[PDB]
Amino acid sequence: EVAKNLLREDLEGVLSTLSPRERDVLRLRYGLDDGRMKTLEEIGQLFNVTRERIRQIEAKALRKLRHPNRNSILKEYI
Amino acid sequence: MKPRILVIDDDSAILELVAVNLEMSGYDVRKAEDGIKGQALAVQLVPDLIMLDLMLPRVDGFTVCQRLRRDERTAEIPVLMLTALGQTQDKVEGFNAGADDYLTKPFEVEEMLARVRALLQRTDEILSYGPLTLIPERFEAIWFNRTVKLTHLEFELLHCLLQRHGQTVAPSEILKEVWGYDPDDDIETIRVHIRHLRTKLEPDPRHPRYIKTVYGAGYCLELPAETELHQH
Amino acid sequence: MKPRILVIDDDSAILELVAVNLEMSGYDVRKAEDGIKGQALAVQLVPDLIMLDLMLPRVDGFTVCQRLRRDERTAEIPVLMLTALGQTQDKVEGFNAGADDYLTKPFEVEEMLARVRALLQRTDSEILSYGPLTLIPERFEAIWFNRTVKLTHLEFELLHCLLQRHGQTVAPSEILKEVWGYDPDDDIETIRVHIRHLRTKLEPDPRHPRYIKTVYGAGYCLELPAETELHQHADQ
DNA sequence: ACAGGATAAAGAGAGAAATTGAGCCGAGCTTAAGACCTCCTTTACCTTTTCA
Numbered sequence: 001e002v003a004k005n006l007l008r009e010d011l012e013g014v015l016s017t018l019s020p021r022e023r024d025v026l027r028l029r030y031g032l033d034d035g036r037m038k039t040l041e042e043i044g045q046l047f048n049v050t051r052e053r054i055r056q057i058e059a060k061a062l063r064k065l066r067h068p069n070r071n072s073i074l075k076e077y078i
Numbered sequence: 079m080k081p082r083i084l085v086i087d088d089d090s091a092i093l094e095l096v097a098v099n100l101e102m103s104g105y106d107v108r109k110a111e112d113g114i115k116g117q118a119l120a121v122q123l124v125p126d127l128i129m130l131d132l133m134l135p136r137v138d139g140f141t142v143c144q145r146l147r148r149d150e151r152t153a154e155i156p157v158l159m160l161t162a163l164g165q166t167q168d169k170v171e172g173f174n175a176g177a178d179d180y181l182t183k184p185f186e187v188e189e190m191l192a193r194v195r196a197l198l199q200r201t202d203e204i205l206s207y208g209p210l211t212l213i214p215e216r217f218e219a220i221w222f223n224r225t226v227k228l229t230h231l232e233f234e235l236l237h238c239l240l241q242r243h244g245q246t247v248a249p250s251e252i253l254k255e256v257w258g259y260d261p262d263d264d265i266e267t268i269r270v271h272i273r274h275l276r277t278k279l280e281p282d283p284r285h286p287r288y289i290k291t292v293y294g295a296g297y298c299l300e301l302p303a304e305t306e307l308h309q310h
Numbered sequence: 311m312k313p314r315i316l317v318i319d320d321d322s323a324i325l326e327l328v329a330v331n332l333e334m335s336g337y338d339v340r341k342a343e344d345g346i347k348g349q350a351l352a353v354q355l356v357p358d359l360i361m362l363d364l365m366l367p368r369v370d371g372f373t374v375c376q377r378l379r380r381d382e383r384t385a386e387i388p389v390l391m392l393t394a395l396g397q398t399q400d401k402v403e404g405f406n407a408g409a410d411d412y413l414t415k416p417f418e419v420e421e422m423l424a425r426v427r428a429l430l431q432r433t434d435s436e437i438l439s440y441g442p443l444t445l446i447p448e449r450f451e452a453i454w455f456n457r458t459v460k461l462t463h464l465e466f467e468l469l470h471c472l473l474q475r476h477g478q479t480v481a482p483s484e485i486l487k488e489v490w491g492y493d494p495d496d497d498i499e500t501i502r503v504h505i506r507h508l509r510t511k512l513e514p515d516p517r518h519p520r521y522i523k524t525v526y527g528a529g530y531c532l533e534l535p536a537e538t539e540l541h542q543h544a545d546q
Numbered sequence: 547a548c549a550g551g552a553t554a555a556a557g558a559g560a561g562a563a564a565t566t567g568a569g570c571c572g573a574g575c576t577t578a579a580g581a582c583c584t585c586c587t588t589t590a591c592c593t594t595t596t597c598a
Binding site: 017052067069 | 104203257259
Binding site for chain 2: 406
């Protein structure tokens with residue numbers, strides 16, 4: 001259970017580096033808050049802009065995380 | 079969670095219209111046909127917003143608002159009053175009711191939703207300006223009347239500059255927002271992509287008019303106001 | 311304290327009506343006739359409420375509101391928008407500006423006062439503008455009367471340092487420490503060079519400087535005319 | 547124990563969808579050198595003050 005609390009923190013940290021909108025998008029697209037993965041369309045309605053906009057945000061966030069900077073600890077969690 | 083809205087109105091047709099429009103907007107709607115049930119439901123549910131009619135039977139809407147303000151559990155709940163607006167006396171009594179906002183019936187659904195959004199932002203992007211319109215879905219810019227295809231990074235850079243239109247953005251801020259890199263990483267990449275933007279957007283890239291270089295500070299996107307487009 | 315209200319409107323008649331009515335209601339009213347001066351006053355004063363017309367010159371009311379929302383010092387200041395209300399597009403763009411409320415012109419004075427009361431019930435440090443100068447930090451520019459002057463970074467910081475001490479003599483050592491962070495004993499002659507550039511940009515006659523005065527043996531003083539005298543200096 | 551009968555809940559048969567990864571390309575991106583334009587510093591020589 002202690003490698004669970006620890007992990008989330010590390011993830012949250014790298015999430016902080018991302019733009020506010022970006023991180024919110026990610027948290028909602030993976031259910032980090034509610035455990036429930038949400039579609040495009042729920043964020044299309046809940047968020048300001050509609051569908052096909054959240055997909056762009058998701059890719060532009062992941063591309064930021066995929067860099068060797070701002071996310072390399074989690075590589076060992078795999 | 080979804081924000082909870084309590085709508086209190088004796089017009090079932092208005093009540094239904096409002097409820098439908100709020101649910102379509104993603105809210106949890108509760109409906110009440112009278113001030114007594116409305117007050118009890120407000121106390122029971124602690125809704126995130128109350129929309130309150132004026133002409134409820136047995137108890138006027140003002141007394142309802144005053145009672146919500148007198149109960150510590152409801153004293154802080156925002157109250158958007160729906161009013162038939164016709165007498166300076168109802169105005170004067172609303173001036174004492176503790177209403178947070180007023181909305182005149184008949185109202186536009188968009189105005190109602192704007193007020194709801196502002197109240198919720200209180201409890202808790204530029205895609206077009208002048209001659210520039212961003213098309214995210216195609217990574218394209220409308221530049222005056224010509225369509226310009228952008229690369230992903232060129233588009234994101236232009237968007238980052240548009241978000242801070244008329245202000246100088248530092249290279250470190252561009253690196254952080256577009257690339258997510260450490261502030262100390264090589265800024266030379268930015269210098270390249272700004273040049274492409276100028277090649278695509280300025281009439282003369284050697285004398286750039288809109289994408290200016292502020293030596294020692296960064297880059298600034300200065301766009302003419304819509305009133306000046308005819309001169310450019 | 312008395313609540314501070316900043317009214318930003320290019321219509322002098324609306325601006326005066328509003329100011330008079332708020333003062334009758336007991337508020338401390340500040341007035342700005344354009345979006346740049348309005349923004350500078352908002353940053354400098356941190357007013358308790360902003361009333362923001364829509365159609366301000368050089369900077370639209372939407373851009374002003376967005377910039378106020380972008381500054382951590384002003385992001386929480388309530389914004390009551392004054393709008394000529396006529397097209398759904400201005401509606402749609404205001405729907406993203408972060409305005410707190412809208413009031414359609416013409417408005418009843420009582421409605422205005424009600425909105426002011428509701429916003430105030432809900433809510434509960436540098437001089438960037440004086441007389442003929444707005445300083446524009448984000449662009450390293452000065453509005454001097456009605457002309458834009460591009461400044462270098464050190465020239466801008468020097469002019470700001472002098473503006474912070476408007477009407478007082480600033481010692482060269484204080485300038486070295488504040489702008490350059492240097493020791494009081496470093497060569498002040500460098501400052502003397504950059505001061506003339508400001509005069510070259512700002513004075514009508516650099517040989518007979520009126521505004522950037524030298525206080526012999528003491529330093530430099532920026533003496534600016536009060537706003538009431540501006541009409542006598544623009545022709546210069 | 548064993549045989550018959552009724553039934554529902556859990557496997558096989560197929561294609562069509564949806565992904566999927568794979569090669570084969572040139573479009574996007576980075577690297578490094580050189581030139582090249584602002585900003586600044588500091589000098590040499592002054593003019594211009596306040597004062598004995």
